[PDB]
Amino acid sequence: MTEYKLVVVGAVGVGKSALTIQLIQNHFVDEYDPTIEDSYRKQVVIDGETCLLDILDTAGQEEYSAMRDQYMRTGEGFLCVFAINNTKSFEDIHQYREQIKRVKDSDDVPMVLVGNKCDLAARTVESRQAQDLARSYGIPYIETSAKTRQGVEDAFYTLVREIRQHKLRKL
Amino acid sequence: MTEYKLVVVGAVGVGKSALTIQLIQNHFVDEYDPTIEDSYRKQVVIDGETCLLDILDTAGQEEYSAMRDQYMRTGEGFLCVFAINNTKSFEDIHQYREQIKRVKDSDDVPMVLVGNKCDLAARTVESRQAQDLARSYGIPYIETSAKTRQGVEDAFYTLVREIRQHKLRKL
Ligand SMILES: Nc1nc2c(ncn2[C@@H]2O[C@H](COP(=O)(O)OP(=O)(O)O)[C@@H](O)[C@H]2O)c(=O)[nH]1
Ligand SMILES: Nc1nc2c(ncn2[C@@H]2O[C@H](COP(=O)(O)OP(=O)(O)O)[C@@H](O)[C@H]2O)c(=O)[nH]1
Ligand SMILES: [Mg+2]
Ligand SMILES: [Mg+2]
């Protein structure tokens, strides 16, 4: 069926692995080797289209750029994630977004901005600032929580839909 | 009288020198040595307070950081400017804003975002994206044109007022 190659990107400790794993196997995982980078797949039905999700769970020292090259130029969409209680991870969103536009020759590649850990009752980054950023970038912003699972399907599926619109726009 | 040390910052070719000079001597200047970095002063009355504006017109290769050190930690406010028809200068706004927060130990230093050259009927950066960015940063955005002079006083004076509020907030 159709196959979407997605890449999950963002600073270390934001919850990239917990989100990915929550999506694939429905269980929250804590303590998962910060170093391990691997792909994950799942057959899903989104909006009636059945498809294959090919997700790259990025890890490793790569100064805010292209963690896993031959997925990065080939990724069809990216999940830019930050933790809602870590302003740095948030401030670093710009750099990830610039390497992505950099290897892909465009400021028009499907992405979604993800504010993770919204279960934490605390916060150093607030909803309106994130969403203004997204609004300036032109992409959606969605808050999730790998822990309670809130928003994880909405985040990945919202990313699929963007890719879809983007493929239909060339006709 | 009161004295405000302001720094004009941004990529080369955006109009930092034309704006500064337009403010100080009311005349548009084209072709002004991209390399020359110097300060400029003017006595003005803003909101009934008479004051001395001490402006640093930043120039020189300094990778998006602290052009003129002993003005940068001492600047009381910064004018972050980009050209409305130069998306790169615009995308680089983040880096300037991070060195400023970097030498000043805070994500709370008076700044104003300036979209210059609004006389050009063209544009690669649009009003709503700039303002969403500003809104996410928490600072004002003002469009100016060193050429026709539109907005140049509003930009500097709006920067003075921010500094004022910021000084009054400690009481
Ligand atoms: N409270 C809470 N902790 C989370 C959430 N997402 C991830 N974590 C924890 O944050 C840390 C980093 O998660 P991980 O997926 O390994 O981060 P990564 O470096 O982006 O892969 C671990 O302690 C996770 O269990 C979340 O939504 N809520
Ligand atoms: N049309 C137009 N050109 C401008 C404007 N501001 C500056 N320029 C021109 O842009 C170039 C760069 O100006 P300058 O102040 O030297 O740029 P800087 O490197 O930021 O100091 C010169 O050609 C200026 O005359 C503006 O508002 N409108
Ligand atoms: Mg991980
Ligand atoms: Mg100059």
Side-chain angles (χ1 to χ4, degrees):
Chain A
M1 358 63 137
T2 294
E3 179 131 27
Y4 300 97
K5 316 287 161 197
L6 327 175
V7 183
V8 193
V9 119
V12 98
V14 298
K16 305 191 284 321
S17 292
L19 276 170
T20 296
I21 273 154
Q22 248 295 1
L23 175 89
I24 293 335
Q25 323 164 346
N26 285 250
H27 58 272
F28 174 42
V29 104
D30 38 279
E31 218 149 338
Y32 166 105
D33 198 318
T35 322
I36 300 300
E37 182 176 84
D38 197 32
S39 337
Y40 286 79
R41 274 168 179 222
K42 193 194 216 177
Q43 272 163 354
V44 295
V45 197
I46 297 170
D47 306 352
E49 182 203 73
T50 176
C51 44
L52 173 59
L53 256 37
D54 194 340
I55 315 171
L56 178 59
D57 185 23
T58 252
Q61 156 51 221
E62 210 274 331
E63 267 293 71
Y64 323 115
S65 274
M67 38 304 287
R68 206 167 328 163
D69 185 79
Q70 277 137 70
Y71 248 97
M72 304 243 351
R73 30 195 117 249
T74 42
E76 288 171 288
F78 301 79
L79 226 60
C80 284
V81 33
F82 72 88
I84 231 92
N85 65 341
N86 183 316
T87 340
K88 199 207 88 74
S89 55
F90 176 66
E91 280 292 352
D92 306 304
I93 280 314
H94 187 80
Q95 329 291 200
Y96 295 105
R97 174 169 169 285
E98 307 292 312
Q99 171 102 305
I100 290 144
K101 298 149 51 194
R102 232 155 64 210
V103 323
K104 289 206 83 113
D105 274 333
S106 52
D107 195 336
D108 164 35
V109 351
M111 14 189 110
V112 172
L113 175 63
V114 180
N116 186 243
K117 298 207 215 276
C118 67
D119 41 296
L120 292 167
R123 275 216 187 236
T124 75
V125 185
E126 226 287 313
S127 313
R128 295 108 282 290
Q129 54 189 128
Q131 41 192 331
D132 282 325
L133 192 75
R135 228 199 312 298
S136 79
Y137 291 159
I139 58 163
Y141 167 63
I142 115 148
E143 304 206 318
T144 63
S145 170
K147 216 255 252 55
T148 69
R149 216 173 178 270
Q150 293 333 79
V152 330
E153 289 175 5
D154 284 322
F156 290 87
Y157 300 5
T158 291
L159 176 62
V160 174
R161 305 174 175 124
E162 295 283 296
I163 292 160
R164 222 122 66 165
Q165 301 290 320
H166 183 93
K167 309 203 265 223
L168 291 175
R169 298 177 218 228
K170 184 47 205 86
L171 276 56
Chain B
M1 358 63 137
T2 294
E3 179 131 27
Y4 300 97
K5 316 287 161 197
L6 327 175
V7 183
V8 193
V9 119
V12 98
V14 298
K16 305 191 284 321
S17 292
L19 276 170
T20 296
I21 273 154
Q22 248 295 1
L23 175 89
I24 293 335
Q25 323 164 346
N26 285 250
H27 58 272
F28 174 42
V29 104
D30 38 279
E31 218 149 338
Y32 166 105
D33 198 318
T35 322
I36 300 300
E37 182 176 84
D38 197 32
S39 337
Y40 286 79
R41 274 168 179 222
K42 193 194 216 177
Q43 272 163 354
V44 295
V45 197
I46 297 170
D47 306 352
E49 182 203 73
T50 176
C51 44
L52 173 59
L53 256 37
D54 194 340
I55 315 171
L56 178 59
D57 185 23
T58 252
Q61 156 51 221
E62 210 274 331
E63 267 293 71
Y64 323 115
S65 274
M67 38 304 287
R68 206 167 328 163
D69 185 79
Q70 277 137 70
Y71 248 97
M72 304 243 351
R73 30 195 117 249
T74 42
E76 288 171 288
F78 301 79
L79 226 60
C80 284
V81 33
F82 72 88
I84 231 92
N85 65 341
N86 183 316
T87 340
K88 199 207 88 74
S89 55
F90 176 66
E91 280 292 352
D92 306 304
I93 280 314
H94 187 80
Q95 329 291 200
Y96 295 105
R97 174 169 169 285
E98 307 292 312
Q99 171 102 305
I100 290 144
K101 298 149 51 194
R102 232 155 64 210
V103 323
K104 289 206 83 113
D105 274 333
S106 52
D107 195 336
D108 164 35
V109 351
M111 14 189 110
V112 172
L113 175 63
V114 180
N116 186 243
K117 298 207 215 276
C118 67
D119 41 296
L120 292 167
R123 275 216 187 236
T124 75
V125 185
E126 226 287 313
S127 313
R128 295 108 282 290
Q129 54 189 128
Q131 41 192 331
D132 282 325
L133 192 75
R135 228 199 312 298
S136 79
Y137 291 159
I139 58 163
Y141 167 63
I142 115 148
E143 304 206 318
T144 63
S145 170
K147 216 255 252 55
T148 69
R149 216 173 178 270
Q150 293 333 79
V152 330
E153 289 175 5
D154 284 322
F156 290 87
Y157 300 5
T158 291
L159 176 62
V160 174
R161 305 174 175 124
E162 295 283 296
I163 292 160
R164 222 122 66 165
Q165 301 290 320
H166 183 93
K167 309 203 265 223
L168 291 175
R169 298 177 218 228
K170 184 47 205 86
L171 276 56

